[PDB]
Design a binder for these strands. Sequence first.
DNA 1: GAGAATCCGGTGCCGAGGCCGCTCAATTGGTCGTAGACAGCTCTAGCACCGCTTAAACGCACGTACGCGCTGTCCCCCGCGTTTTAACCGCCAAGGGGATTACTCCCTAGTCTCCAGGCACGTGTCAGATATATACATC
DNA 2: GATGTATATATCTGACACGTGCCTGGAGACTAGGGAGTAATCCCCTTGGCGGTTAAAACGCGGGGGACAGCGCGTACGTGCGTTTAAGCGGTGCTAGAGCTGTCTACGACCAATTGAGCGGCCTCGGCACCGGATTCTC
Lengths: 205, 99, 100, 78, 79, 92, 92, 91
Amino acid sequence: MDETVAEFIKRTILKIPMNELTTILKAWDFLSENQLQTVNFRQRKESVVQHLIHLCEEKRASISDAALLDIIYMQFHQHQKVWDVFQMSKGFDMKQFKNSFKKILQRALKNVTVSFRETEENAVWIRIAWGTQYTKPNQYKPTYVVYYSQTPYAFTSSSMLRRNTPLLGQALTIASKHHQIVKMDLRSRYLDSLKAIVFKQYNQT
Amino acid sequence: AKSRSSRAGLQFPVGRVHRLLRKGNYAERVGAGAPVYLAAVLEYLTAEILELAGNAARDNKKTRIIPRHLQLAIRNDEELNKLLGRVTIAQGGVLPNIQ
Amino acid sequence: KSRSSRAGLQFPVGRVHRLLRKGNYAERVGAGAPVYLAAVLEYLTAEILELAGNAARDNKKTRIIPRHLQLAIRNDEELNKLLGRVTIAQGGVLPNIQAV
Amino acid sequence: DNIQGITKPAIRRLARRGGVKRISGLIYEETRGVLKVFLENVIRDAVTYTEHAKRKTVTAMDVVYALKRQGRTLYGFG
Amino acid sequence: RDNIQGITKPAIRRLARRGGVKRISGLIYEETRGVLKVFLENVIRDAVTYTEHAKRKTVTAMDVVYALKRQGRTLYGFG
Amino acid sequence: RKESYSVYVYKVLKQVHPDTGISSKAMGIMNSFVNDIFERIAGEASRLAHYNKRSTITSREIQTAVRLLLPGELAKHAVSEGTKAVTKYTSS
Amino acid sequence: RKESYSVYVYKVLKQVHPDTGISSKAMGIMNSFVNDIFERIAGEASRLAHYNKRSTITSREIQTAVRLLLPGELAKHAVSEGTKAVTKYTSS
Amino acid sequence: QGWLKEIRKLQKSTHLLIRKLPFSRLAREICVKFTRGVDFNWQAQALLALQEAAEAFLVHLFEDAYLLTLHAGRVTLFPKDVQLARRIRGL
DNA sequence: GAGAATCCGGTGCCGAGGCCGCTCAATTGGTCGTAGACAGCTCTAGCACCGCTTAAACGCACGTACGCGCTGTCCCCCGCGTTTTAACCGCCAAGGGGATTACTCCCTAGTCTCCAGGCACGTGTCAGATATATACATC
DNA sequence: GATGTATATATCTGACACGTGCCTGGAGACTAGGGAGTAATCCCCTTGGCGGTTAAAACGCGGGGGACAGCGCGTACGTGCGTTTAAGCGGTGCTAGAGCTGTCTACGACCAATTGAGCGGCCTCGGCACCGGATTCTC
């Protein structure tokens, strides 16, 4: 394998606390539980991740599995980031949506990285790593989209890298079966308040 | 409720090889540890020849394996040429060999 | 009453059937096969030993030695293609001489 | 005819693949000859299998098995 | 101390006379001593395996006959 | 306790020849001949019990194996002799 | 209803390579590769169940068949990998 | 020159160097002469299989027999070369 | 020092990979006969060695029969341009038989039981091996 | 014309064809249950043909490129012959090693329920094959 994704997985697991690292690695579903039994969970963190990488040196790795680990890490640290709320209008399986969004985005720019994850209430967590037409995509400044199939609403993570916001908006509007995209005032830290302020109005229109 | 290849830590199947090695009439008694070992050997051989094929595939700026890439990855390597000596790969062609 | 004498053969039939049961070749062995097999083996054995005995007779010796089988195989055309990848102990070669 | 379909530029391209620089003229008979004495030993060694499983159709597996028994193992077409 | 020169300068000549060669050259005496050696490896490494499998320190004749049959050059006369 | 095929080759030789003796070494060659052809034919016909998805070896499979493993005229004489043996085996 | 080995070769290729696709014809070659090596080794090891007058095929006979049917360095890597698979199969 | 481009071209592509229907009519003519009277159906993949085997065999034969023309100092093949190349193997 | 070879871009197209329905074959689990690992004892046949002895290799000197580079001659494939031709593509009909299922039946397998054949052992004795001596074939 | 070249026999030497005892694998018998051979069927894969094009093969021609034949120098190889070294006989010892006879146990066939891993059908969309364009190379 390449010698770039190992630093990413090491940095991501170094960001994970010891309180639920076994929960992350059981939910990530990538290594054998015998190899979970082999790893000492009592020494310090600066060698546990070395042993886990040395497990992942041998068997399998990618950028997609590291991205899905990053998605599961971001799903349990919603207190950190600050979210944004969008909505589409002017107008269903999710497989065609995934293919359409990928294609579109890969036809828009040269180098992007897209990753999906299925979650209940028909939720999809979409990690986007932006790039240019000459550079590698920056994995360390992602952009996360919480999209629902039923509601036309989408939760948007802020990032350092702007200027791809209307490109992502139009590519997701064409990628969906829609024509318009809005940008409300709703920018807050916790997802449940945005969830309530959307769903109290949408379920009771 | 639990897979045989998952205990084996492999990717090729184990029950199918054991089924063929019983139904092929090779011996009247089949030891249990044999087809796991045999499937690991087959996995290493296919892994070696595809690992040699993919480098020549990226050498020709391609990502889809055609039989010409397998022909070159067999004939350039020495030990696989010792193994696959009397085999004509279909749609293969020959090495660039002049004088 | 023996199955060798019942079919009018000379090679055994029970031993060939024993080697087809315990040879791991198929799960069931018919009865019409090993008599056919022993007949074919008897014909091939007679085919070799006729030429071997004639070549032994033409060398004025009353005993068969492996040089005579070497000459009989390498002078016959059919056994040259049947036994084309065969070395024979105490063999020797054909008297091959060639000039420019 | 039914043998002159293997024309002169066909055998010429078969030689130019093999690295042959300059070709003589009599080759264009002997090669055809050896081509026939190849294909016969593939045909009947195929068709006996076709006469065993009592069908009037030569499958591709029959030709692969005839070449298997002949010595030149063929891949792919199985 | 020479260990391959037990093959002599005229034993190769006797094998070439049996083959029917009128006049050997020079460095053939240094060439054939290579080739034979290579061939013996592809018997003996192939014949030490079978006798390793049957827990026998004795390399019988049947083992060499089986190895020569597996190489392709079938030998009859022994057994 | 370790069987061979010497007696039968000796009987065939005394059948098709009056008094031609055979040495004890060349007879060994005949053993390694006819422990070999039996390894081919009754090996290879087993393969024809596998391509057609069967489990038996009848006379027909041995007949086709003889049609394959032998060159022309020798195969014709062998297939002409074998059924001649089988037909006088059937009406026992 | 007529099985093959396409899915497993595809999984191994996606393991040791990120996105290198394989055509539907060359995959067929891989079928006739690995319906062939299995015919050699698990054929030839059966022969070693017959010379030693046995009736089983354990891991040791397959190990010796791999020692025979492969040239040197590839055989060394294969025998080093197979027992590594077996030892983590035993302590299940 | 010319031939130096053709060797570089034909060793690159992996086509069929023999046309389909003459080879098929030749294979059917050979198949008629054995076990006469009845015809024989051919699947469309089997003739392609036999054509690939025959092309690989003839290319390997010419490439093997060419090395007995550089050895004699010549440049050009001869039927002596091909017959000697078959004499060496034992086919 | 400019037609030919190499890299590049645009566009159609079509097969490669993702997805769903499903079914049958691989898993799990408990039972029992037995194949073979394991130990120990017994005959045998392979290795080490040595003295002899002698047959063959070893080393060399030399004469000379091919190896090889050269060169002259003559013929003979290859590139080129024109004419001809059959291979192929796509279609359209049709039909021969390949694959599937049913059903009975029959023929081989297993186990028991009885004894005739094929193998190990032993022995006189003829076939040839080698050796010497003597009648033909020859550059 | 002496040097091989084939033949007479000397005898001597041991393998081998043969005779006997004998252990065990082959024959007789018969049940039973799966393998398969026969019968029907329906589709599906192959065969035959119409037709039009377009690459692809056939044919003259001339010209250089190469094969072939002679030839001289010479050097690397065969041969003759004395030596000296290592190979064979054969004989002793003599012990590691095949093998084979019991045993007991872990182990793999054998079998009933059950479910998901993998196979068949489908549908794109990006990878790729081809077509046309811009940048190098030797005669």
